[PDB]
Amino acid sequence: TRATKRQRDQLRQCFDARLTDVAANAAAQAWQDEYEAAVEPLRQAMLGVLAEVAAVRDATASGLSQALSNARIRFFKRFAALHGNSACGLHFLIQLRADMLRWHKRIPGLRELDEDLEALFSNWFDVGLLELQPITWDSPASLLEKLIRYWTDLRNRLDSDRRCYAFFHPRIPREPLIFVEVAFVPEMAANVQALLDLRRVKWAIFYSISNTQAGLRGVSFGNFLLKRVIEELQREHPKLKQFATLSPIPGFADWLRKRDGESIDRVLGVKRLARWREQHGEVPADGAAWFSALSADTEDTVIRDTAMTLAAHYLVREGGKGVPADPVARFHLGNGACVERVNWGADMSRKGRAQSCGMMVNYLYVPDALDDNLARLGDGNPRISRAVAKLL
Amino acid sequence: TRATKRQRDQLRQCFDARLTDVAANAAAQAWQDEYEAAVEPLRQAMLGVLAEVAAVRDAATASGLSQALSNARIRFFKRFAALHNSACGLHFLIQLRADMLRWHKRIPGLRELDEDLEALFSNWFDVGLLELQPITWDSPASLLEKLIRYEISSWTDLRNRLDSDRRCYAFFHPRIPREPLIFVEVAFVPEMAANVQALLLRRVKWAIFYSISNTQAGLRGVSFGNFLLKRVIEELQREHPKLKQFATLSPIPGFADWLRKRDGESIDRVLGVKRLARWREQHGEVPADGAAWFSALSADTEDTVIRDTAMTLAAHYLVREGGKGVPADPVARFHLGNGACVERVNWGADMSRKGRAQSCGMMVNYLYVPDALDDNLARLGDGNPRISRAVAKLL
Ligand SMILES: [Mg+2]
């Protein structure tokens, strides 16, 4: 407890003093510097002090929880207001959450600080407050090297028949927050290997949307994220009317192998179960066995249909009400999209086959429907196309 | 595919050929070298090939496929554990699982390989097959530096822990010397310890285990058996036939995370009407839920009502929470799964920053009674953990 008492005092001001208090802000400015210029273990230790200070007050039970919540929030608000080596107070806060996130298992007691900040980060970095910028092969190398971490590959993705953007917070230029990759093709894509590999093109397809900030993992950017990109695409090409994605279904395999036989029988239905026995005999004993049976032949029509029905069910009817179990389905469904179609042999990479038997999905975005769909999702009734309803 | 087809062929033999097949073993020997001498991304890629091969069968019913796939993965590991860079085939397998474990999120499709190997590792490294060795300040520095990695960075900490009034051991697999598998730290004191900060020969009567750690990343999650501490006590009794008192001063790491996930209703049921009444009388409002309970129980380390309330919640957590015969707490599961008895809950036992954050600074003593370890191990399978009077009273 040498200088660790100076940091405690500093943090007490940042947590307890009013936002305007010039002294407390000075203290915050001080703590930041000392944190940015510190070895990895020193920071992990400073985080231990922070979770120490955040857990107590320097008096009902309901009033304690509230006072503790209000101080943690006050602590972050003060830092987000300081306009060092990072872009500003808001930026620092992003790196700080990066550490809290990777060291959670080492430094206990940050769960509440992490949850609060994540929630603040959802208001501060809401898409409505972010600026959209086009990214090309002409962009600064120092910027382009932030999208690789989260070069000829970049090139093709950044080519004439391609369009890429990045959302930035106005006061943190240089630091891309979200990276959107778009491809132009004649038909709504059904195989990802084609894309990653302007005359008469009619389809705009989003084949990649990634969060490029570790400190922002888990933060919600709003439901108008792609809506905003489409507006930019229409301004750029008023002739573009067809918008869809060719997304993965990452949590399909892990979900399937957790289901027993009974649940899958209920999903498939009597007719599908019968078509399976007729072609393959024995019905897999459970989900795990189902995954192994559905990966054994990418050519079989019964396997294809069975897998596609299981996939449509997974992304449309699995989740805690209005919240698709699949993260990818949650994002796109949570942006006003419609689950338009399931694609077999869409991603035959090693990873694709391991995540969903190489199955991908197309989420269709219809400008003048995004609102209606966003509503229907809250009712726990995801917007679906005829082809997908037929698989169910 | 320039060479990724050579590894696929190699792996096919290792998975499909008989264990004796000289060619397949050669192939395995080859794949190992190529893996040990490869950049991080190259290995992550080779792991992608492995999960590719493990998911399919070369050139059958559905139940027969799952079995054939299980039998090949098992055959793949058995072949490697039989060979003699790393100490041997078995050792390599340990590092291989180290990568599978840290890259699971990056390289999908290893879940089955990981599960199978973890299960094999439980038979191969069962305590009954491991040799016990004393560790002192005289041990090779190259060995001592494997226990620091897995406890201040100052070797002076190792020193005190490796001193006259202390006794430390390490379990090694006979064919992998140099590589400690488990590290046990023991302290000798006059009274069953109630405060960890203290531990860190003339008239000492208590032998207490204040630390037991797995020193191999590739072995995380593997079960070493229920005779782990039993074996160490035998060594302690051989060494000091006068020692009859054995206990631990363990942490309760998952207490806080469990508590904040409980609603008010569940805690009311745990505490009981009388305790809830004693709480209102002294502190007024009852915390709305578990999260609020944790914040209220951390606000005053001096209050007697807070202490008792927290201790009851703690005893409940480790004795009555878990999927039948399997204590929710990992630390409670290990020690309960070794024949121990939850002997007592200690308030203000670990007042470190971490201690207060994990369990409000509360620690627990698991008592080991040689001629009872079996009986307790049985009672735990019935979902009725062995408990002392003091802990039953908290419940
Ligand atoms: Mg209540």
Residue numbers in the entry:
A (entry chain A): 58 to 115, 122 to 146, 150 to 216, 225 to 271, 279 to 473
B (entry chain B): 58 to 116, 122 to 146, 151 to 216, 221 to 270, 279 to 473
Quote what the paper states about this structure.
Malonyl-coenzyme A decarboxylase (MCD) is found from bacteria to humans, has important roles in regulating fatty acid metabolism and food intake, and is an attractive target for drug discovery. The MCD monomer contains an N-terminal helical domain involved in oligomerization and a C-terminal catalytic domain. Unexpectedly, the MCD catalytic domain is structurally homologous to those of the GCN5-related N-acetyltransferase superfamily, especially the curacin A polyketide synthase catalytic module, with a conserved His-Ser/Thr dyad important for catalysis. The catalytic domain of MCD contains a central eight-stranded, mostly antiparallel β sheet (β1–β8) that is surrounded by at least 11 α helices (α1–α11).
Surprisingly, CmMCD is a dimer in solution and the crystal structure reveals a completely different mode of dimerization as compared to HsMCD, RpMCD, and AvMCD. The two CmMCD monomers associate in a head-to-tail fashion such that the N-terminal helical domain of one monomer is in contact with the C-terminal catalytic domain of the other monomer, including the helical insert between strands β5 and β6. Approximately 1,100 Å2 of the surface area of each monomer is buried in this dimer. In addition, the helical hairpin insert between αC and αF is absent in CmMCD. CmMCD lacks the helical insert in the helical domain and has two additional helices between β5 and β6 in the catalytic domain, which may explain why it cannot form a similar dimer and tetramer as HsMCD or RpMCD. There is an insert of three additional helices (α5–α7) between strands β5 and β6 in HsMCD, RpMCD, and AvMCD, while CmMCD has an insert of five helices here. In the CmMCD dimer, the second monomer is located ∼20 Å away from the active site. Moreover, the loop and the following helix α4 are positioned differently in RpMCD and CmMCD, suggesting that the binding mode of CoA to these MCDs may be somewhat different unless there is a conformational change upon CoA binding in these two enzymes. After significant efforts at optimization and diffraction screening, we collected X-ray diffraction data for RpMCD, Agrobacterium vitis MCD (AvMCD), and Cupriavidus metallidurans MCD (CmMCD) at up to 2.3 Å resolution.
